[PDB]
RNA sequence: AUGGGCGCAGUGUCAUUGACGCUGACGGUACAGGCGUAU
């Protein structure tokens, strides 16, 4: 019920082969570009097959950017 | 009283000169009159251990003012060979320098000084400073204008000689 | 500054090797000086200087994931903590970690906005350094942001 | 969850490439959008697919038999 | 015993808890002995004691993988050393591990004739201790993975 | 898959704060897209 969604992840993981690092280092960056296009098509689908039924424990990972925000306020220093 | 004969060892008034008078009245001299033979200048310090007196023979880095030269040298009890890091010349002259400062004290501890690391324009990298690691000298990068590293070299001196390694200067 | 760009490198290219184990061991010595097995100013800055030395060194998603989580634990580190001073050293590194790590602030408006803020807040303060940090950090984030100030 | 749902999400979040600009500029656009559609073609082909896709016999193809036959060639030779 | 069974219970939550934590902890360990750091006999007997205590703990494919990445170093460490007392030592802590570990075997019909064909090697050696392990981990590996014997 | 000459970000070599690239967690959040093309 949940074991094949975790080997799902971990083969589209690994059916990622990321990609062969050859060249000029602006052709080297442009394929550092694309493996990261692939690393952010990867992540978005892991996180899309976390919302289906998953999303319901995992969902604050891209709102932690406010709630790091109100720890980062309130550094109160009321005292010694 | 305990006092002990430092011998300075570099171009005459490159720095040699300025750095003693920088510890002595505080002043960063600005011109440049080479150093002639050698001053003989005492300079105290006030540790967590109580006073201590260098006999600083800031000698002239110039031979045709060399004078006595490395007579100088005798019964020397520390080293501080000088360096400016934005002439290269100076720097390679350093083997030579130690090499006459090894002859005469066999067995000294000797403080490589890079001076004038304040003026921006730097020529010996600190890449390249290694002659002290084959001869096991203990290396600063000072510069007696901003006074980066003012004390380190005669802290290190000062600590090597009394023996105590975790020994402090106290301001009085 | 010959010796940090030496030790830097050295680390990048290690990162390079593997990145994961660099990251956990952050996390592990962070964790160590928050449960208070190796708290002391000195261990906290170097690690502090530490995780600023690799800035960039990482992939973007990675390197926002750890930053997000040192972050969040220097933030516990500071709640837990009271007297002046240690507020002050873990504030000052903090801000300093922050200014080495452009490419997440401009990946977050909001996050500049706070910090710059939180930098506001700093510069009236009158204990011994937190302006010069600031001041220092807030040059950083300008000289690697500006583009995301005026637009 | 559903093969649909997935297909018209992947093609939603590609925007087509830009009609203004140059014949040259949106000609090269067109080209890096449709390599980069081939790519999430194959990728969506893929989930299509199954939802496992591989077996893992490929690691003792790598890994297990390159250990396994090399223990059998241990040998003690003393010491 | 008891003892030990707590201790194995605790580190099998953990493992339950944060189970990456534990296998790097495994790893820099065994790395530790690999590269002579850290190298005794107590210590890796210690070491594979607790690599085999929390069997069942990980997922099929992270134990397998944990488990190859450790023979593999284990096997090195092996043809490393010299010595016929340590590489006994290596020996019987690898068939004590693989042991505990009967799963893999079971899923893995070759490596599982290759271990019985080494262990019945092994059975002829004089040294001490080899063939009472050997016979222990043959009895273990029997009661663990008779239908692979049969079938 | 390809990398051009410069937007300068670290710099290796020498005559070393000058020049060739590499390289820089860069001036670049840029630009180049066979010679109609359905490879």
């Known amino acids: 019920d949940l074991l094949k969604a975790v080997r799902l992840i971990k083969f589209l993981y690994?059916?990622?082969?990321?990609?062969?690092?050859?060249?000029?280092?602006?052709?080297?960056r442009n394929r550092r570009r694309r493996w990261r296009e692939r690393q952010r098509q990867i992540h978005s689908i892991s996180e899309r097959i976390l919302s289906t039924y998953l999303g319901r424990s995992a969902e604050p990972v891209p709102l932690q950017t406010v709630d790091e925000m109100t720890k980062k306020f309130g550094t109160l220093t009321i005292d010694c | 009283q305990v006092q002990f004969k430092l011998v300075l060892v570099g171009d005459g008034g490159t720095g040699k000169t300025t750095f003693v008078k920088r510890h002595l009245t505080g002043e960063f001299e600005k011109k440049y009159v080479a150093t002639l033979g050698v001053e003989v200048?005492?300079?105290?310090?006030?540790?967590?251990?109580?006073?201590?007196?260098?006999?600083?023979?800031?000698?002239?880095?110039?031979?045709?003012?060399?004078?006595?030269?490395?007579?100088?040298?005798?019964?020397?009890?520390?080293?501080?060979?000088?360096?400016?890091?934005?002439?290269?010349?100076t720097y390679k002259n350093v083997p030579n320098w130690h090499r006459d400062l090894v002859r005469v004290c066999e067995n000294?501890?000797?403080?490589?000084?890079?001076?004038?690391?304040?003026?921006?324009?730097r020529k010996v990298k600190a890449k390249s400073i290694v002659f002290h690691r084959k001869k096991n000298l203990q290396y600063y990068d000072i510069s007696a204008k901003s006074n980066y590293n003012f004390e380190k070299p005669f802290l290190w001196l000062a600590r090597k000689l009394i023996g105590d390694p975790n020994l402090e200067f106290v301001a009085m | 500054?010959?010796?940090?760009?030496?030790?830097?490198?050295?680390?990048?290219?290690?990162?390079?090797?593997?990145?994961?184990?660099?990251?956990?061991?952050?996390?592990?010595?962070?964790?160590?000086?928050?449960?208070?097995?190796?708290?002391?100013?000195?261990?906290?800055?170097?690690?502090?200087?530490?995780?600023?030395?690799?800035?960039?060194?990482?992939?973007?998603?990675?390197?926002?994931?750890?930053?997000?989580?040192?972050?969040?634990?220097?933030?516990?580190?500071?709640?837990?903590?009271?007297?002046?001073?240690?507020?002050?050293?873990?504030?000052?590194?903090?801000?300093?970690?922050?200014?080495?790590?452009?490419?997440?602030?401009?990946?977050?408006?909001?996050?500049?906005?706070?910090?710059?803020?939180?930098?506001?807040?700093?510069?009236?303060?009158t204990h011994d350094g937190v302006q010069d940090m600031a001041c220092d950090t807030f040059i950083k984030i300008a000289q690697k942001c500006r583009r995301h100030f005026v637009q």
């Not at chain 3, 090797?17 to 208070?36: P, S």
Request: glycine share 6%; proline share 4%.
């Open chain 1, 14 to 28: 690994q059916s990622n082969p990321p990609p062969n690092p050859e060249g000029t280092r602006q052709a080297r």
């Open chain 2, 41 to 89: 200048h005492p300079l105290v310090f006030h540790t967590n251990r109580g006073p201590i007196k260098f006999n600083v023979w800031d000698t002239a880095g110039l031979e045709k003012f060399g004078g006595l030269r490395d007579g100088y040298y005798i019964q020397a009890q520390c080293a501080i060979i000088m360096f400016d890091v934005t002439s290269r010349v």
């Open chain 2, 108 to 121: 000294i501890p000797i403080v490589l000084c890079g001076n004038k690391v304040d003026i921006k324009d």
């Open chain 3, 1 to 125: 500054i010959n010796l940090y760009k030496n030790m830097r490198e050295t680390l990048v290219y290690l990162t390079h090797l593997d990145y994961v184990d660099t990251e956990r061991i952050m996390t592990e010595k962070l964790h160590n000086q928050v449960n208070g097995t190796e708290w002391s100013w000195k261990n906290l800055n170097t690690l502090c200087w530490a995780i600023g030395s690799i800035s960039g060194a990482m992939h973007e998603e990675d390197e926002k994931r750890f930053l997000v989580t040192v972050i969040k634990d220097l933030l516990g580190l500071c709640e837990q903590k009271r007297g002046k001073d240690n507020k002050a050293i873990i504030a000052s590194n903090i801000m300093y970690i922050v200014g080495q790590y452009p490419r997440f602030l401009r990946a977050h408006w909001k996050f500049l906005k706070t910090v710059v803020n939180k930098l506001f807040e700093f510069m009236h303060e």
